[PDB]
């Protein structure tokens, strides 16, 4: 059913840089590609289409190339505002087909995160349950694990994760890890503990407190 | 020039039916082409149909037929698409948009609506609640943070010390646990200014109608 695929999810550069995204389809769809630009507040453009026609409006540091089954999006000099998910659709035959898109983002220093651990509210334990939360702040680049250990044993249940989208200042990203567990579960455990290892370092960073402690 | 505007956020229950719009201007509605589509977080946009207004003449993703029906009203010069059946693989964002020939052969979109969010869930409006972070038991910069749980449906609006904070903060999106959304904020300060001046996390969930302080205070033990 021709199915667009853009292997890249995610593509890290600096402003001013030349970057390329790809995008591949099933069978030939005969040079009958097109780009769009879908910033973060959700707003759609159209770039370029029959694979390397610029559509009007467009500035000129937007290019296209391509043929059969292989096409490529290529913007010359990065500006901020090119920051935004990129993606394809084939206009060769139906239904219309789009790639799952590319996110671009910028690139900086290596920075490790500021971690920080918070146990439960007094004022959740009345109400039974009990949240252990971990702030992960300010860290490049965006891959990051967590790890919750209970004592001895790892823990992977009640654990959410939420992650911001890159900043627009300091091109940092952060991300808060949370351990969700009722009050009786909480109160048969002494040691929490929240790991994060990061490129930036071989050791994992270490937030822990202790439930008997005051 | 061309613009389209799509409906606002939409709740639903399963096996309900909702009902989209989109008004177009600055062209003439009833000669270019109007389609629908339909973005889920992980996956890639999806096509559903499109509509010729003036014959109402309609084709349908066959994944679509019976799910999704596409109308349009000249006199108004808008769109709609009503969702029937509903289920949670159904919640997604919908854009609506108009086809273009920019070369002869070819099917593009040119002009995009700003995408209407459908939410499916049998869950109720609930309002959140909200805990204060505050460490255990020291350097130059310290870390609080309130928690914000329970609460249906989005968005909920989070400030500190009514909006004196704007640096040092970082809130984070939501997440679905049991049919409810969570979400925590952090705040960064000297660690200075902190017993002893107040810092005070501002929950706002304007569903429910409530609004919430909880001032953090460090927690001694005793």
């Known amino acids: 059913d021709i199915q667009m695929t853009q292997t890249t999810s995610s593509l890290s550069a600096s402003l001013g840089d030349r970057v390329t995204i790809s995008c591949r389809a099933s069978?030939?769809?005969?040079?009958?590609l097109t780009w769009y630009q879908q910033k973060p507040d959700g707003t759609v453009k159209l770039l370029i289409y029959?694979?390397?026609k610029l559509h009007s409006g467009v500035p000129s540091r937007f290019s296209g190339s391509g043929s059969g089954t292989d096409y490529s999006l290529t913007i010359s000099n990065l500006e901020q505002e090119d920051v935004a998910n990129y993606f394809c659709?084939?206009?060769?035959?139906?239904?219309?087909?789009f790639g799952g898109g590319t996110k671009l983002e910028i690139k900086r220093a290596d920075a490790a995160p500021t971690v920080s651990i918070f146990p439960p509210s007094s004022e959740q334990l009345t109400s039974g349950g009990a949240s252990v939360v971990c702030f992960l702040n300010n860290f490049y680049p965006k891959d990051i694990n967590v790890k919750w250990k209970i004592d001895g044993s790892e823990r992977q249940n009640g654990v959410l994760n939420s992650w911001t989208d890159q900043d627009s200042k300091d091109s940092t990203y952060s991300m808060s890890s949370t351990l969700t567990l009722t009050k009786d579960e909480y109160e048969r455990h002494n040691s929490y503990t929240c790991e994060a290892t990061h490129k930036t370092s071989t050791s994992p960073i270490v937030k822990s407190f202790n439930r008997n402690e005051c | 020039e061309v613009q389209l505007q799509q409906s606002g956020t939409v709740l639903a229950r399963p096996g309900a039916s909702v009902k989209m719009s989109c008004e177009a201007s600055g062209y003439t509605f009833t000669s270019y082409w109007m389609h629908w589509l339909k973005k889920r977080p992980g996956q890639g946009l999806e096509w559903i149909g499109t509509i010729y207004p003036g014959n109402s003449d309609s084709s349908y993703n066959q994944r679509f037929k019976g799910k999704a029906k596409l109308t349009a009203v000249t006199s108004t010069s808008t769109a709609y698409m009503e969702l029937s059946s509903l289920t949670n693989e159904d919640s997604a964002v919908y854009y609506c948009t108009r086809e273009r020939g920019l070369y002869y052969g070819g099917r593009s979109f040119d002009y995009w609506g700003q995408g209407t969010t459908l939410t499916v869930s049998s869950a109720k409006t609930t309002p959140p609640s909200v805990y204060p972070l505050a460490p255990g038991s020291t350097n130059s910069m310290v870390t609080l943070g309130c928690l914000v749980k329970g609460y249906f449906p989005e968005p909920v609006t989070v400030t500190w010390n009514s909006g004196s904070l704007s640096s040092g903060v970082h809130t984070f999106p939501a997440v679905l646990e049991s049919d409810l959304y969570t979400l925590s904020s952090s705040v960064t300060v000297p660690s200075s200014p902190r017993p002893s001046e107040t810092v005070t996390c501002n929950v706002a969930h304007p569903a429910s109608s409530t609004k919430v302080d909880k001032k953090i205070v460090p927690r001694d033990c005793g």
């Open positions: 069978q030939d769809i005969s040079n009958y």
């Open positions: 659709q084939q206009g060769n035959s139906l239904p219309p087909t």
């Open positions: 029959y694979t390397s």
